[PDB]
Amino acid sequence: MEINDHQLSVAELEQKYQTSATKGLSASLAAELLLRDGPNALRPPRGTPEYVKFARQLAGGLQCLMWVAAAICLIAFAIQASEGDLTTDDNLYLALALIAVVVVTGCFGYYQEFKSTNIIASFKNLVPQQATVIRDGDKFQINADQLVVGDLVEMKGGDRVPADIRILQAQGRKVDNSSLTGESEPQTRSPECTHESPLETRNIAFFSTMCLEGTAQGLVVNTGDRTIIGRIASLASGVENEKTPIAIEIEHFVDIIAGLAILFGATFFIVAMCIGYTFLRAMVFFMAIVVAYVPEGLLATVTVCLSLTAKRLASKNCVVKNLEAVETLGSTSVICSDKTGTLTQNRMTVSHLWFDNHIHSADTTEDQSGQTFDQSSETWRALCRVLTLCNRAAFKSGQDAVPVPKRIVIGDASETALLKFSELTLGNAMGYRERFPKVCEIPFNSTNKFQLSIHTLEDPRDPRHVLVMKGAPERVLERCSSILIKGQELPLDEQWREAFQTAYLSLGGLGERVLGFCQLYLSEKDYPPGYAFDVEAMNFPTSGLSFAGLVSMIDPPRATVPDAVLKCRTAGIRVIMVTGDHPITAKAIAASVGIISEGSETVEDIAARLRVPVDQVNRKDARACVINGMQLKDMDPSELVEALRTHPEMVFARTSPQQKLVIVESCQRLGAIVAVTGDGVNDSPALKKADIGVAMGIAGSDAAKNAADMILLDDNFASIVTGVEQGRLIFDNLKKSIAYTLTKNIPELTPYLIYITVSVPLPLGCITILFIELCTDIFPSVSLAYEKAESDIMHLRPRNPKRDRLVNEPLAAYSYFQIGAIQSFAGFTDYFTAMAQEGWFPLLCVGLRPQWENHHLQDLQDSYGQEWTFGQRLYQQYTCYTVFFISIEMCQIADVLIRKTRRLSAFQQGFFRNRILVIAIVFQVCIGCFLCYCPGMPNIFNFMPIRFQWWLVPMPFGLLIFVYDEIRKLGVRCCPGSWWDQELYY
């Protein structure tokens, strides 16, 4: 936190600054200093990321996996350069394919982020502005950047504070520190030192804060970057992002894949050497096996998957600056939210009214979703006209269509709230204020601040003049005698008088501001209809007036907030309110939004009820706590951790931005994922430090918006809820997709394995494998992303990064060990059927490859004794590849269906409801059928038309896969703690 020189005698202040309070500085010096340090302006965003940033998208962690994969393939190709190799179509193709995926995916992702930035640029509207300085005794308006340190400056109503100043003099000046400090209502500024902390003191004005009203002079304490907001702005750029949870999960994933890759590559390398293959061959096998383990398509399928989800978020008006940022929300354990602007509307409005010695709450909501009071009473009518009539507040031309609350009004704070209220409940104030013509009024006086005005009568019954006046309850209490009730007057009795007093203290204690409203009919006999009374003499009996009632006011939370917080809590997310506002209001709002449930007592509540010193009560008995920022400065790390751990519902009030940062950090110390939602600049350091920052599109400031990882254009808090939900379903579906693709590797890799072991003609080729991995499975693989919630995900607790893994041992245990195996056997069965039918019985196929592969041997005896040339048998091998391809597809049908659900049976969820999956298998089968049957296929791809009978051979295997996993899906549902769930269930 910062420090300052604010508390100093003006003589001492100027003594230090070497400046004249009335005259300011001399032009010469002003120019000298301006040239010395630097103009009054923050150094432009030290970040001018060139288009070279595109490269960023290319590296990442995942793209690196494909990069190394591509490199490995290239090297393998380089190794096979040792001899004449077929790789011209194999390895180089793959390596290039890998590079193609990283670059294409990179381009796509980059464009997305770029589009968002462009949209952001559209919003920037800049105005240089100017400042009013006083030098050599003369007032001159110069460019704000020209402002130096230690020179007198004058601020008026509406002008922005050019730089941090130390107010020397002021007159009814009220600056708006809403964004910087977070203070809701306009804080008045004065020459005298009020508080120790320079942020709360009145003797200092701040940069970027507009002065609502009044005027004031001040010596510039800080200029440019050294200013407060500049300090915050600078800090909001030195924080680190930290690795996204989804990113680490994929890191673990690659570790597993690579692990399996190396194990088999190495094990088989040794095995190959044992057999006889030269080292060269052993090495090519090593490279081959490893490279084969790398899923090229999975990078595309994952990227697209995230993109699809992101697109949905965009539709919801929830934009993600980063692609990985989509999953995060499904991992948030704590939400540090700001009060004003975020949880609330940040707009003041009439709260409660006092009529017939009763308190009636008005509708504070922006949307007017609350309940209206009983307007029937006459007392209400009278008070309404007094509030409506006595005001300078009036709607500006143009606010007809707009809602009465959101519409702008020209007037004071209270008068605006009062005007809006009148217009809403009692009807239009236009005709009403026009009804009674105002002859002479007395604006709020410098002292006693009473404001009165007298009008004529509109009513036909009595022609008496009507007098109205509003002011502080105590001052007005001094001037009032009679009290009105239900339309009839009465004198004041101590019982009711005190009732009024207690009511005043009650509402005043509620945190609201109360205003006394009174009126008095004039003795027309004494004051004739023609009598013209001026402001000079006491024409109206200021005393003996009839006091009507009081009207208080406050600002409410947004309409969506309460329900959003309840959902976040039901989700198991801890909601902590971190605000710089006053504790009295902070707690009230907290209880309103639900951060502090009812019945939950703070340490003070207990001390209050028991009427015992606050220090006595044991903190353990208090579940909720409102920690004052004053203590926060003193607290240590162990202190914060204790507070955070010991109290379920917490609210940090009067906390500086730096403190909000320490709170977020303290929550991170626990090792939990924190999400911060804010509005103003005070949230800039917090929002950037949080695992995920959340700014408000409109209600949010620029600094905080730049710091935020996510922005809400609609400023709907409910979106947060949707956000947390949107993050957990995609995780399960990713598992589905991954599992599916991973299952294909067994039937793809095995053919080449056995080829080396048994020495049988190659069952599946390279082109074939590519058609499965890149051609067919692509649609089904994406279709699974469309899978819906298997059960109520919102009910389950947030996953544990340590325990739960996207891809874990169990998944591999079934994609590779169980299902994958079944598919492999299906493929080989198809292989043997074709071969056996052609004339090559399975038993004879062993050790045939050496002769088979040889292009020279034209005479190759089959089981019948027939002699096959090279092309002939090779044709059979190719017509043998197609069927294996098709077989994979057929097995993939069953795999896709079972992959659809993790726990539930096909019955329940019904994988068929998903239309995209349906079109997935129809297109998949159609394509496979095409590749085999298309006329030029055997020439280009070496894929030949398949005899119809062939299609059936892989059928029974597919059924086995389905029937097998289905029972597994049933046993798991029956036996939660079953042995199957532990092993199977991934």
Binding site: A821, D859, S863, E867, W868
Partner: protein
């Protein structure tokens, strides 16, 4: 990675991969059943016989003469093994790739089968069956020669199997 539970993994696959190998073999064995021991289900691949040669690029039996095809009957076991007929400037020998029940039909570049053997009955039916010179002037040069066979039954695939019914070798006798 577990402990005192691996037995639940090992034993599992032992009787899982077992069930799978048992089913895999189960399917191969049924397939094998639906095939003749004497003739393949498809001859189409070998449709047009190819011609191969020697140059790496009889007790019992029956006496015969150049004549028409000889039918040993049907391709069955009821009859014992069907009897088979008897039979510088490099010499290369050519033969016709044997194909069951196939009857061949028959009833200047640089300087340089009897039907009584068909149809071939196959190895199982006929084990010891027996299927039926470039004195050129030039030398010290690579000569491309293409020896092919003719017939309605014989077809050539110039674009593909250069062996289909024909040869293509480059002899060079450098002296």
């Amino acid at each position: 990675r577990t402990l005192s539970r691996w037995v639940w993994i090992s034993l599992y696959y032992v009787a899982f991969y077992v069930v799978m190998s048992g089913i895999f073999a189960l399917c191969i064995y049924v397939l094998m059943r639906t095939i003749d021991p004497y003739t393949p289900d498809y001859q189409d691949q070998l449709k047009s016989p190819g011609v191969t040669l020697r140059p790496d690029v009889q007790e019992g039996s029956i006496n015969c003469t150049s004549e028409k095809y000889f039918f040993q009957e049907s391709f069955l076991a009821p009859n014992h093994t069907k009897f088979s007929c008897k039979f510088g400037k490099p010499c290369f020998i050519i033969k016709m790739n044997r194909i069951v029940k196939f009857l061949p039909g028959n009833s200047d570049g640089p300087p340089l089968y009897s039907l009584h053997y068909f149809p071939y009955y196959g190895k199982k039916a006929q084990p010891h069956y027996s299927n039926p010179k470039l004195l050129n002037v030039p030398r010290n040069r690579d000569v491309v020669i293409v020896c092919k066979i003719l017939a309605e039954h014989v077809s050539f695939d110039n674009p593909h199997d250069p062996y289909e019914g024909k040869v293509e070798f480059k002899l060079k006798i450098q002296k």
